[PDB]
Design a protein around this ligand. Structure first.
Ligand SMILES: Nc1ncnc2c1ncn2[C@@H]1O[C@@H]2COP(=O)(O)O[C@H]3[C@@H](O)[C@H](n4cnc5c(N)ncnc54)O[C@@H]3COP(=O)(O)O[C@H]2[C@H]1O
Lengths: 349, 349
């Protein structure tokens, strides 16, 4: 959905006075055909008859005017009502796949002038917005809320399985018994989880102000998942990898590439052709995840720590004095690192 | 019914563009509250909100605008539509005998402003017109046509009886055997016939263009009745009476006074007590009726003939030579008088 169309869709999203008027119109089963233009004079060839109003916009005014047949013309910023009861006459030769005089008119006029035209039939509860060559059907809140609520419920389920996988991976990581299969399984679940978020995004945007709670729920459920996934990529990829490369790996699996076991392992730098092989590849975390998340060690400085020790296992075998031999690590960083790892190994294993 | 009010009625009578619109409004069961003013700027105290239109009036525009709630404001000559969807706020203290917000509003505004206010309820088919302290309910054509058709059919009956009484009196006149009862009976039916005409007149006016055939029918039926009644009064009044005085006698019995036997005989100049005495009084026609309607002799000249011969009876016995001794009667008029009378006697008696 082009950013261009997205901007127009906001004009009729829950929260706007315009949308408030369209909802009333739908609730009353009145129909509507609205043409948005800033300079009516320039479009006098497509606008016939009706009443010249040139008055300040209001949702109540639009609703009342919609009781009359014909079309209403508003300024593009929806601050002025120019005409009411007009006959819109776009070029008949313009191709259109719409049905009925009202929708065929709206599409042709939108294509012809490059402006927005809103159509609402009396029988249905949807709002059809035509811009240029785009057509976007806007749904009622009830339909959206239902879809969004089910998606959120679905996400809770994915997140729960994700936390179960992560907790088990945590134990293995601390015991240095991690296999490629363990990592791949955790990443795949994390990728699948973030995909759902991406897919439900448009519904939430279309919800406008009625999507505030939904946004809060999504944020609470996926708060630190992206970072966590990036750190897993950095900790288990075949060879050293930057936070940028990892972040890119994440974006690829959430959209383009499909999160399949082999595909994920392959992108991580492992040469595998069968899923069964995964349980045969032993891997060791570099330590980035634990250093940043638990030890609260900045990634930049973390590269230094991994530079010297290579793996979390070797980092947990170092002492305060030993750890301080790394640039950026003082008695404080050294303590945080050492104490945080030792504490986890005692509580988790 | 005041003339200043009859003028306003014409504004919504069948045939006008305004009435065409109101008929449609009624057919669609839309309601209507129309305010007719000349200077829109001067009523900012009773007119609130709505849309300023200042556009040319048309029946279709009014109809379309009546779909919205509220009132419409038109110019007094029905050439412009000033406002639509407005809230009318007349003084609440002004007395009103109307029921419902719309009609109470209409009567108050008309009284407060001295202007015309038209109200139409959604459920009923009558147009209520308010002007100053007047209220006139206009009916649909179908209701008016039924009443008018009945009245005409009734007039046909009275006219048929008038014609029979007239032919009977004609015989009696030619034979000089007329009694006051015969005269009064004929005049009575003639006064009753013209009264019916007077009572149906407002129905005819209210029919507007749709009353053309009705008017033609009333004219054909009562054509020369008035003249005939005036001539009878002149021929049978106790003492010589001027035409104007006869016409005034007619006007009175057609509106004010009641055409009862004794009453008519009284006004004719005969001192009668009981209606049974009428058959006892013998009277002789002066001759005006026959001289003017049959001999085509102007009243100014007929006076001369009566002045000399005194009665139709004597006139019928006068020779051409005798008649030519009268001022205004030459060989031509003498022949016409003599021949027209001898012809009637031969044919009728
Ligand atoms: N001051 C008041 N006191 C008690 N009830 C009140 C009221 N004001 C409004 N209402 C109630 O609301 C109903 C509908 O109001 P509405 O404006 O839609 O629909 C109205 C309106 O479009 C028109 N109308 C009435 N008075 C008007 C006024 N002063 N100015 C402009 N339009 C008026 O006639 C329609 C029907 O009138 P109706 O009385 O049958 O129906 C009224 C009445 O039952």
């Amino acid at each position: 959905v082009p950013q261009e169309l997205i901007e127009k869709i906001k004009l009729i999203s829950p929260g706007t006075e315009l949308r408030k008027a369209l909802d009333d119109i739908i609730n009353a089963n009145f129909g509507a055909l609205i043409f948005l233009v800033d300079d009516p004079k320039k479009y006098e060839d497509v606008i016939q008859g009706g009443f010249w109003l040139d008055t300040d916009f209001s949702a109540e005014k639009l609703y009342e005017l919609s009781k009359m047949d014909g079309a209403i013309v508003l300024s593009e910023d929806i601050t002025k009502i120019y005409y009411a009861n007009v006959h819109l006459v776009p070029d008949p030769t313009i191709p259109t796949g719409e049905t009925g005089t009202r929708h065929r008119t709206a599409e042709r006029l939108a294509k012809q002038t490059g402006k927005v035209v809103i159509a609402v039939s009396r029988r249905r509860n949807i709002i059809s917005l035509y811009y240029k060559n785009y057509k976007y059907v806007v749904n009622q809140v009830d339909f959206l809320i239902s879809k969004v609520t089910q998606a959120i419920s679905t996400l809770e389920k994915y997140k729960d399985n994700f936390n179960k996988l992560l907790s088990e991976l945590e134990v293995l990581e601390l015991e240095n018994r991690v296999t490629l299969a363990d990592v791949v399984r955790t990443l795949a679940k994390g990728f699948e989880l973030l995909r759902i978020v991406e897919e439900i995004r448009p519904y939430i945007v279309e919800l406008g102000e009625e999507g505030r709670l939904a946004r809060m729920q999504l944020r609470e459920l996926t708060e630190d998942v992206d970072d966590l996934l990036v750190l897993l990529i950095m900790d288990y990829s075949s060879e050293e990898v930057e936070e940028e490369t990892a972040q890119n790996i994440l974006q690829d699996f959430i959209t383009r590439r499909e999160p399949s076991p082999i595909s994920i392992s392959r992108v991580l730098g492992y040469d595998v052709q069968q899923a069964a092989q995964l349980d045969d590849v032993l891997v060791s975390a570099r330590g980035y995840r634990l250093l940043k998340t638990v030890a609260r060690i900045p990634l930049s400085i973390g590269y230094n720590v991994v530079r010297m020790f290579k793996t979390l296992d070797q980092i947990s075998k170092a002492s305060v004095e030993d750890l301080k031999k790394v640039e950026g690590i003082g008695e404080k960083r050294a303590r945080a690192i050492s104490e945080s790892i030792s504490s986890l190994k005692h509580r988790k294993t």
